[PDB]
Amino acid sequence: APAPFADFAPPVRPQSTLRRAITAAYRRPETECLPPLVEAATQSKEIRDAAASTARKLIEALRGKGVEGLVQEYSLSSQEGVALMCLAEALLRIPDTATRDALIRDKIADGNWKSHLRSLFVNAATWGLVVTGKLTSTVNDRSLAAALTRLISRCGEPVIRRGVDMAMRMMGEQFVTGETIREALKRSKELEEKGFSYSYDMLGEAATTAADAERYYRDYESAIHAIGKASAGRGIYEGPGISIKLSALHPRYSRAQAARVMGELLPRVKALALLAKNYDIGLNIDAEEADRLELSLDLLEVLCLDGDLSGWNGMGFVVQAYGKRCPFVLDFIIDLARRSGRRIMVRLVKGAYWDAEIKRAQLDGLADFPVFTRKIHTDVSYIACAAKLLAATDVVFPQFATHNAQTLAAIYHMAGKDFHVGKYEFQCLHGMGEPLYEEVVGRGKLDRPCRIYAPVGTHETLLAYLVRRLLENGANSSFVHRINDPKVSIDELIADPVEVVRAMPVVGAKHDRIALPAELFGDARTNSAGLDLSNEETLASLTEALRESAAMKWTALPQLATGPAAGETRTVLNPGDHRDVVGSVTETSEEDARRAVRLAADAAPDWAAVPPSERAACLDRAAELMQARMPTLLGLIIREAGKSALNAIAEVREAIDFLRYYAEQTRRTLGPGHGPLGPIVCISPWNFPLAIFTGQIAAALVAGNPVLAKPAEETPLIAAEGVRILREAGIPASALQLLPGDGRVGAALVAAAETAGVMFTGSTEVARLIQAQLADRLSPAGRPIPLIAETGGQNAMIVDSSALAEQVVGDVITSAFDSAGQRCSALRVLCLQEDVADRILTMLKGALHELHIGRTDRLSVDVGPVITSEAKDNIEKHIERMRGLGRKVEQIGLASETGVGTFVPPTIIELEKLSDLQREVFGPVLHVIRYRRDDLDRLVDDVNATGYGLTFGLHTRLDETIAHVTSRIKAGNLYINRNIIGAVVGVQPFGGRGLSGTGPKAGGPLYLGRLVTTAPVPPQHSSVHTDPVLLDFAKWLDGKGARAEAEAARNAGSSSALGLDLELPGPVGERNLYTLHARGRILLVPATESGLYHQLAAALATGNSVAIDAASGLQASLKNLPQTVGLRVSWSKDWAADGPFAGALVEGDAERIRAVNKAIAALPGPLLLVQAASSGEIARNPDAYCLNWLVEEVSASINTAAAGGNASLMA
Ligand SMILES: Cc1cc2nc3c(=O)[nH]c(=O)nc-3n(C[C@H](O)[C@H](O)[C@H](O)COP(=O)(O)OP(=O)(O)OC[C@H]3O[C@@H](n4cnc5c(N)ncnc54)[C@H](O)[C@@H]3O)c2cc1C
Ligand SMILES: NC(=O)c1ccc[n+]([C@@H]2O[C@H](COP(=O)([O-])OP(=O)(O)OC[C@H]3O[C@@H](n4cnc5c(N)ncnc54)[C@H](O)[C@@H]3O)[C@@H](O)[C@H]2O)c1
Ligand SMILES: O=C(O)[C@@H]1CCCO1
Ligand SMILES: [Mg+2]
């Protein structure tokens, strides 16, 4: 077996001094970046005065001179303008104008456009940007439909015709320079005669499949031939050139795939560069996301050092001045030019991905942003980098891309009075910069050339680039926007950002309204930190720490309060390669499991006496220890549990977040009256072997309970290391005991007499057995043993014809095949609307064939093994049964190296009905169903009908579909236009309903209260809403003289948090929502009339209906019930036939409570959260039944950056 991590992530080449200087600046503090930029950007008072004059002149000329005119002419509202353009766009898809015109004149103009015409409004977000300048992530299609009907009924055929002509002209003339390269070359002559030049971009980026990359390659190749022939030997300065995006040329363009990039992408760029050289035209590599900057430099370096490209100065490269590495990148490029004997064209830009970079750094928990956070900082950076470029015009050709008249004038005077063509040039984007550069090019203006970046193509490739332009055009900080804002004066426009920054009290201070990733949660807690796997320093130090982790002799032992116990001992083997021994585990005898519980019971008063803030301090220290040890922990998780590096980072971050979140929740809530339960048994799954392991233990400890920690049999080593860390942090040995072993060890703990509570995460099947065993037991107070049982999923994603296919496929690949599908949250059923299913499935299969499956100690591995042979056989048996029914089953091929481990390839199975699935299949197996749009409501029924309710995804841009689907789906974690595996602690509190969970959600504010005998009031836990049926019940109680019960009912109505509706703090570009709903139908088992009244008040106040045990004999107690209340009330003789229920309320003595609890455990379907109280307790304690457990939590995470940008960050 190869040495673990020996080939984890070797760099493309050894990092030079100049390359290292780039990497060191990647996330440098903004206060450190700016002072040297300010100094480099400084110009004399003479130049500053001169530049202000020129800038003012330019702005005066621009201010001294489309859809807006169409809106004015027909008095359209904004929504009417958007709807009109959507209609026009659709009408233009009719290829025969005669057919189109007849349809307009005879069907659309008089009556419902709907009857004669996939939503009309799939592209409304884009038209919304065109019409209003604002971007919304999703569209209100009911408002747009209303507006379209209104404008047609008002204005008839003439406005439709104007809309069609206006759409035609915009999509063919304004959005692009031409739809084909030949047409774009024709239209260039007018401005070329005037001294402009051109750089053409065949629109295209982010190849998803091999076929995508090949098509984009062929477009670039055809364009170079056409541009080269048009250039006709004009050369790289006066003749036209081409721009390319590297992400267009390979479906896996990333640092993680560097070997494939250098072996497969580089030769394609070399071939194109060879053509560009042969025609002597410029070829420019566009700059993209920040995590691709340094990788693109390796391609630039190999190209520039290639002798087949010598004698040609047309190699070009963009550097983004909004990036912190920009000046150091320029130092590298200038030196590369000297080393390679060429002149390199350098396009200086600000940058096009700002919103996405802010969101990405926050999601990833990194030290800082790789871009500036104040716009003026970007301006200063640009000026300072222009100074560097102009000092080296002998070896680079500076190309100053900007629409900012102040920026332009600063550089124009910086460059001095000596100019010749070829010294430097300006650049602008087609349809944006011509008015400004009409004031620049020519002997009668500034006499400086400008190259126009010219997008070429049709709507099929237009979207992404067009949105970026429109966002740039409408952003309130953008020059092209401010120049049209009459509220913005010219003196403000010509303000020198270098002097404004120089005069600030803290030079380079971060933007006040953008949180660093560590600060996402403010004063409440510190966010866990990740690791940047695109940073070469990080990859080199990680490589060494990971190799060192593989040399450690990891062990896991039964760690009882008295010390480690002996037992059956065996090796722990890497699931991806059984030759790789990871460590040794000694497993717990059933007798020692029972002994551990007695020891926990003896130690329980000592741990409960540790005050809550000091218990929380233990958790916070443990989080610091894990953060510091993250590199080592990653290596163990990678080798023990089949995880990739990214998977393992998420695992450790999640454990850190649980620790700090439950610590903070404890400091917010727990006091002396919130007594611990006693010894708590924590039983955890293999698939999140540190995160959920740590989360359950940490919550139980901080609530004051000693813990018996029973990790899954497959993954004991990381659990032992987690226990070592918690003990190191101050948890006493007697308060936290580790009991490795199989399910028999779990069962022995669950059954032990002093066990006071059980926290279980695992399969629904095992949870049912645990609930059965617990129903035989009672606390010494005569009440049920609390059980949190978070179980399996059958998770669906619904995709309609308005979704963006590329985005769907990325989120599907992640949701279904991340960790080989071994997430409880994993996508199991992809539901595709029929008319887009084939296209999406073709793209999905193409993306599947680009995944690398193998042993996970290489950065290039995407998908790891399944945990055991047993798991592998269980998965393959399902795939066989599906094959046996004639279902189409497709799999990707596995390399022969996977033979020493247990791997299952990503598998796609086409179903006929959702009922084909009978059970959670915990592996890389995605099932697909197609649906007709009119069947959407019934499809949601079919998803709900499995009985599960964990995660659920919806991809749509239509608000009506979002509203419909999210009001009808029954799942605990919802995700809109993103993947469905998010579980960020305190942001997406995670946990489901039905067969998926009892609740309360891990990582949410109700969790700790289940682990004490008297639950606290969580932060922000209240509601001003009062259930109206509860109100009617209280009135009926008053009407029959039951004054004390009516009072209790009104008190329950107020205390209920039903209707809570909160936005949780999280990253930008996302809205994370947390709401409290009714649970459903509650089984009521009363003993007395007043007991029944109290149970009814509790259930009604929380929005529930009820089934009352008919054997109670209390039927006469509810005569003359108001219809509103009776509508919520049924009587049950056979509880099993009237389910499923969502909880239960029991009244009786200890004997009755146990008898009822056993019968409830016997019920089919979901595990029920049961609450019990004696008659005297109901009379004495108004909180005898806790309303926390009668509501259901729902988390919803909405990607609001999905349409292309961030609307709040546009401000
Ligand atoms: C011909 C041409 C080619 C280009 N090629 C590329 C390319 O290959 N890759 C690429 O990424 N960009 C590229 N750009 C730049 C990008 O597309 C925008 O056009 C450019 O950033 C706008 O800058 P400005 O001087 O026109 O306008 P301005 O209004 O002066 O500057 C706007 C810019 O400031 C930045 N910014 C906005 N808010 C903040 C903030 N809060 N904190 C820090 N910075 C902020 C953003 O970069 C924004 O685009 C190109 C631009 C042109 C004209
Ligand atoms: N709802 C959630 O948040 C969530 C999170 C992660 C995983 N899961 C679920 O966990 C499962 C995967 O983990 P797993 O394969 O390790 O599950 P599992 O049910 O096989 O095993 C879970 C744990 O229970 C123990 N166990 C087994 N039999 C027992 C018994 N009779 N009595 C007491 N304990 C017993 C196991 O040893 C292990 O520690 C999947 O079903 C997955 O969906 C749910
Ligand atoms: O694609 C973009 O938005 C930038 C601008 C032109 C090239 O890269
Ligand atoms: Mg198991």
PDB file of N, CA and C and ligand atoms in Angstrom, residues 683-688 692 710-712 742-743 746-747 760-763 766 769-770 790-792 824 920 922 950 990 996, ligand 2:
ATOM      1  N   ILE A 683     -25.473   7.730  21.681  1.00  0.00           N
ATOM      2  CA  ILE A 683     -25.185   6.705  20.682  1.00  0.00           C
ATOM      3  C   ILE A 683     -25.147   7.382  19.317  1.00  0.00           C
ATOM      4  N   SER A 684     -24.074   7.175  18.564  1.00  0.00           N
ATOM      5  CA  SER A 684     -23.830   8.021  17.405  1.00  0.00           C
ATOM      6  C   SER A 684     -23.562   7.190  16.158  1.00  0.00           C
ATOM      7  N   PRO A 685     -23.804   7.759  14.976  1.00  0.00           N
ATOM      8  CA  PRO A 685     -23.605   7.021  13.724  1.00  0.00           C
ATOM      9  C   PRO A 685     -22.157   7.095  13.252  1.00  0.00           C
ATOM     10  N   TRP A 686     -21.799   6.201  12.313  1.00  0.00           N
ATOM     11  CA  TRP A 686     -20.428   6.226  11.799  1.00  0.00           C
ATOM     12  C   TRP A 686     -20.204   7.413  10.868  1.00  0.00           C
ATOM     13  N   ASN A 687     -21.253   7.898  10.176  1.00  0.00           N
ATOM     14  CA  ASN A 687     -21.006   8.695   8.975  1.00  0.00           C
ATOM     15  C   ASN A 687     -20.590  10.135   9.264  1.00  0.00           C
ATOM     16  N   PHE A 688     -20.938  10.676  10.437  1.00  0.00           N
ATOM     17  CA  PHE A 688     -20.394  11.937  10.938  1.00  0.00           C
ATOM     18  C   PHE A 688     -19.712  11.622  12.267  1.00  0.00           C
ATOM     19  N   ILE A 692     -21.408  14.718  14.948  1.00  0.00           N
ATOM     20  CA  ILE A 692     -22.593  14.357  15.720  1.00  0.00           C
ATOM     21  C   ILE A 692     -22.190  13.682  17.024  1.00  0.00           C
ATOM     22  N   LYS A 710     -21.114   6.176  23.238  1.00  0.00           N
ATOM     23  CA  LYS A 710     -20.989   4.916  22.507  1.00  0.00           C
ATOM     24  C   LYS A 710     -20.892   5.237  21.023  1.00  0.00           C
ATOM     25  N   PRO A 711     -19.696   5.333  20.464  1.00  0.00           N
ATOM     26  CA  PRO A 711     -19.572   5.616  19.034  1.00  0.00           C
ATOM     27  C   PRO A 711     -19.895   4.376  18.216  1.00  0.00           C
ATOM     28  N   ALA A 712     -20.198   4.612  16.937  1.00  0.00           N
ATOM     29  CA  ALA A 712     -20.417   3.523  15.997  1.00  0.00           C
ATOM     30  C   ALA A 712     -19.190   2.617  15.928  1.00  0.00           C
ATOM     31  N   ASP A 742     -20.130  -2.584  19.346  1.00  0.00           N
ATOM     32  CA  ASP A 742     -21.191  -2.710  18.351  1.00  0.00           C
ATOM     33  C   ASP A 742     -22.543  -2.330  18.963  1.00  0.00           C
ATOM     34  N   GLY A 743     -23.637  -2.718  18.297  1.00  0.00           N
ATOM     35  CA  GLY A 743     -24.961  -2.362  18.784  1.00  0.00           C
ATOM     36  C   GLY A 743     -25.312  -2.989  20.123  1.00  0.00           C
ATOM     37  N   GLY A 746     -24.393  -0.523  22.715  1.00  0.00           N
ATOM     38  CA  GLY A 746     -25.443   0.483  22.787  1.00  0.00           C
ATOM     39  C   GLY A 746     -26.656  -0.012  23.548  1.00  0.00           C
ATOM     40  N   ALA A 747     -27.086  -1.249  23.264  1.00  0.00           N
ATOM     41  CA  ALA A 747     -28.288  -1.764  23.920  1.00  0.00           C
ATOM     42  C   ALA A 747     -28.064  -1.960  25.415  1.00  0.00           C
ATOM     43  N   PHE A 760     -29.852   9.567  20.561  1.00  0.00           N
ATOM     44  CA  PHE A 760     -29.554   8.607  19.508  1.00  0.00           C
ATOM     45  C   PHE A 760     -29.596   9.294  18.155  1.00  0.00           C
ATOM     46  N   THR A 761     -28.545   9.113  17.370  1.00  0.00           N
ATOM     47  CA  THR A 761     -28.580   9.435  15.951  1.00  0.00           C
ATOM     48  C   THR A 761     -28.151   8.183  15.189  1.00  0.00           C
ATOM     49  N   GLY A 762     -28.949   7.786  14.208  1.00  0.00           N
ATOM     50  CA  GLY A 762     -28.748   6.506  13.543  1.00  0.00           C
ATOM     51  C   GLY A 762     -29.980   6.156  12.723  1.00  0.00           C
ATOM     52  N   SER A 763     -30.077   4.875  12.360  1.00  0.00           N
ATOM     53  CA  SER A 763     -31.163   4.437  11.496  1.00  0.00           C
ATOM     54  C   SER A 763     -32.484   4.410  12.251  1.00  0.00           C
ATOM     55  N   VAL A 766     -33.081   1.043  14.147  1.00  0.00           N
ATOM     56  CA  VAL A 766     -32.443   0.885  15.450  1.00  0.00           C
ATOM     57  C   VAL A 766     -33.131   1.755  16.490  1.00  0.00           C
ATOM     58  N   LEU A 769     -36.071   0.063  18.135  1.00  0.00           N
ATOM     59  CA  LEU A 769     -35.691  -0.894  19.171  1.00  0.00           C
ATOM     60  C   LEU A 769     -35.374  -0.193  20.483  1.00  0.00           C
ATOM     61  N   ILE A 770     -34.685   0.948  20.407  1.00  0.00           N
ATOM     62  CA  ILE A 770     -34.317   1.702  21.602  1.00  0.00           C
ATOM     63  C   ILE A 770     -35.565   2.237  22.301  1.00  0.00           C
ATOM     64  N   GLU A 790     -32.797  10.965  16.233  1.00  0.00           N
ATOM     65  CA  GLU A 790     -32.682  11.651  14.953  1.00  0.00           C
ATOM     66  C   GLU A 790     -32.278  10.606  13.915  1.00  0.00           C
ATOM     67  N   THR A 791     -33.157  10.352  12.945  1.00  0.00           N
ATOM     68  CA  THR A 791     -33.029   9.129  12.161  1.00  0.00           C
ATOM     69  C   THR A 791     -32.928   9.380  10.654  1.00  0.00           C
ATOM     70  N   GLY A 792     -33.368   8.425   9.838  1.00  0.00           N
ATOM     71  CA  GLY A 792     -33.028   8.432   8.428  1.00  0.00           C
ATOM     72  C   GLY A 792     -33.835   9.440   7.618  1.00  0.00           C
ATOM     73  N   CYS A 824     -27.018  11.684   6.117  1.00  0.00           N
ATOM     74  CA  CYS A 824     -28.452  11.514   6.343  1.00  0.00           C
ATOM     75  C   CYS A 824     -29.267  12.485   5.494  1.00  0.00           C
ATOM     76  N   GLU A 920     -34.624   3.790   3.250  1.00  0.00           N
ATOM     77  CA  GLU A 920     -33.440   4.604   3.039  1.00  0.00           C
ATOM     78  C   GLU A 920     -32.288   3.719   2.557  1.00  0.00           C
ATOM     79  N   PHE A 922     -28.464   3.961   2.029  1.00  0.00           N
ATOM     80  CA  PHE A 922     -27.423   4.871   2.517  1.00  0.00           C
ATOM     81  C   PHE A 922     -26.138   4.691   1.704  1.00  0.00           C
ATOM     82  N   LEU A 950     -36.785  14.679   6.402  1.00  0.00           N
ATOM     83  CA  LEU A 950     -35.524  15.224   6.880  1.00  0.00           C
ATOM     84  C   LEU A 950     -35.149  16.433   6.032  1.00  0.00           C
ATOM     85  N   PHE A 990     -30.689  21.504  12.513  1.00  0.00           N
ATOM     86  CA  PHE A 990     -30.859  20.351  11.649  1.00  0.00           C
ATOM     87  C   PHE A 990     -31.659  19.268  12.352  1.00  0.00           C
ATOM     88  N   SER A 996     -38.031  10.505  10.372  1.00  0.00           N
ATOM     89  CA  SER A 996     -36.729  11.159  10.372  1.00  0.00           C
ATOM     90  C   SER A 996     -36.320  11.734  11.723  1.00  0.00           C
TER      91      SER A 996
HETATM   92  N1  LIG B   2     -31.293  12.621  11.527  1.00  0.00           N
HETATM   93  C1  LIG B   2     -29.894  12.912  11.567  1.00  0.00           C
HETATM   94  O1  LIG B   2     -29.484  14.018  11.923  1.00  0.00           O
HETATM   95  C2  LIG B   2     -28.909  11.872  11.143  1.00  0.00           C
HETATM   96  C3  LIG B   2     -27.539  12.213  11.038  1.00  0.00           C
HETATM   97  C4  LIG B   2     -26.558  11.277  10.602  1.00  0.00           C
HETATM   98  C5  LIG B   2     -26.965   9.978  10.343  1.00  0.00           C
HETATM   99  N2  LIG B   2     -28.323   9.616  10.489  1.00  0.00           N
HETATM  100  C6  LIG B   2     -28.676   8.245  10.176  1.00  0.00           C
HETATM  101  O2  LIG B   2     -27.728   7.365  10.710  1.00  0.00           O
HETATM  102  C7  LIG B   2     -27.685   6.218   9.894  1.00  0.00           C
HETATM  103  C8  LIG B   2     -26.234   5.925   9.534  1.00  0.00           C
HETATM  104  O3  LIG B   2     -25.458   5.661  10.675  1.00  0.00           O
HETATM  105  P1  LIG B   2     -25.256   4.155  11.158  1.00  0.00           P
HETATM  106  O4  LIG B   2     -25.119   3.236   9.974  1.00  0.00           O
HETATM  107  O5  LIG B   2     -24.042   4.113  12.042  1.00  0.00           O
HETATM  108  O6  LIG B   2     -26.629   3.770  11.882  1.00  0.00           O
HETATM  109  P2  LIG B   2     -27.064   2.639  12.774  1.00  0.00           P
HETATM  110  O7  LIG B   2     -28.580   2.665  13.115  1.00  0.00           O
HETATM  111  O8  LIG B   2     -26.545   1.450  12.128  1.00  0.00           O
HETATM  112  O9  LIG B   2     -26.123   2.691  13.928  1.00  0.00           O
HETATM  113  C9  LIG B   2     -26.211   3.798  14.825  1.00  0.00           C
HETATM  114  C10 LIG B   2     -25.663   3.544  16.236  1.00  0.00           C
HETATM  115  O10 LIG B   2     -26.576   2.737  16.979  1.00  0.00           O
HETATM  116  C11 LIG B   2     -25.824   1.667  17.495  1.00  0.00           C
HETATM  117  N3  LIG B   2     -26.711   0.522  17.579  1.00  0.00           N
HETATM  118  C12 LIG B   2     -26.957  -0.450  16.628  1.00  0.00           C
HETATM  119  N4  LIG B   2     -27.874  -1.294  17.107  1.00  0.00           N
HETATM  120  C13 LIG B   2     -28.254  -0.912  18.387  1.00  0.00           C
HETATM  121  C14 LIG B   2     -29.140  -1.385  19.347  1.00  0.00           C
HETATM  122  N5  LIG B   2     -29.924  -2.562  19.113  1.00  0.00           N
HETATM  123  N6  LIG B   2     -29.277  -0.740  20.513  1.00  0.00           N
HETATM  124  C15 LIG B   2     -28.556   0.372  20.802  1.00  0.00           C
HETATM  125  N7  LIG B   2     -27.680   0.870  19.893  1.00  0.00           N
HETATM  126  C16 LIG B   2     -27.517   0.258  18.700  1.00  0.00           C
HETATM  127  C17 LIG B   2     -24.676   1.486  16.580  1.00  0.00           C
HETATM  128  O11 LIG B   2     -23.665   0.729  17.144  1.00  0.00           O
HETATM  129  C18 LIG B   2     -24.305   2.898  16.296  1.00  0.00           C
HETATM  130  O12 LIG B   2     -23.500   3.410  17.318  1.00  0.00           O
HETATM  131  C19 LIG B   2     -28.517   6.488   8.685  1.00  0.00           C
HETATM  132  O13 LIG B   2     -29.786   5.930   8.784  1.00  0.00           O
HETATM  133  C20 LIG B   2     -28.600   7.974   8.712  1.00  0.00           C
HETATM  134  O14 LIG B   2     -29.661   8.519   7.986  1.00  0.00           O
HETATM  135  C21 LIG B   2     -29.307  10.562  10.887  1.00  0.00           C
END
